[PDB]
Design the sequence.
């Protein structure tokens, strides 16, 4: 019930428009190649799990 | 999460991680 | 006695060319102003 | 709620942001959620009214 999130969870941290720049921000992201909690959808009655710092 | 009573989905966790972005000429993130 | 050697080696050596010191000077000026703006 | 004047140094205030400058019509495209506009120097360069 665990898998590898390749490059997922990257988003726009602000509503600023920027064009062709390499901007370095520091806030909450899902880390690269993290061990995200895979689930099966085909246990399945009541799958409650905690919310710590935001979930993907 | 609830579904509709009568699929390889994830759930991840967020952490204060530094990340370098790559905006394109359209203002979207390409890398 | 070897003028054709000079003209051919002149073509080839500039052919190898087609700037470490020069691009360095442009870059150090660029990072100097960019840190000044980001202050 | 003032009208828009261009090609002249004004003291604009668009949706609660300060700044002076001259407003020019542009052609670059935004995303629907984006309001500000910045360059490498981290200064405001564009805003839609």
Sequence:
């Amino acid at each position: 019930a665990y898998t590898n999130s390749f490059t997922r969870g990257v988003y726009y941290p602000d509503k600023v428009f920027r064009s062709s720049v390499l901007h370095s921000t520091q806030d909450l992201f899902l880390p690269f190649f993290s061990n995200v909690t895979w689930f099966h959808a085909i246990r399945f009655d009541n799958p409650v799990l905690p919310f710590n710092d935001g979930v993907y | 999460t609830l579904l509709a009573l009568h699929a390889a989905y994830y759930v991840g966790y967020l952490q204060p991680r530094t990340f370098l972005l790559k905006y394109n000429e359209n203002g979207t993130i390409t890398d | 006695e070897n003028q054709k050697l000079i003209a051919n080696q002149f073509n080839s050596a500039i052919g190898k060319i087609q700037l470490g010191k020069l691009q360095n000077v442009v870059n150090q000026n660029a990072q100097a102003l960019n840190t000044l703006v980001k202050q | 709620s003032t009208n828009l004047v261009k090609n002249k140094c004004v003291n604009f205030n668009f949706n609660g942001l300060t700044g002076t400058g001259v407003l020019t019509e542009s052609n670059k495209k935004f995303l629907p959620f984006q309001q500000f506009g910045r360059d490498i120097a981290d200064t405001t360069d564009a805003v839609r009214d």
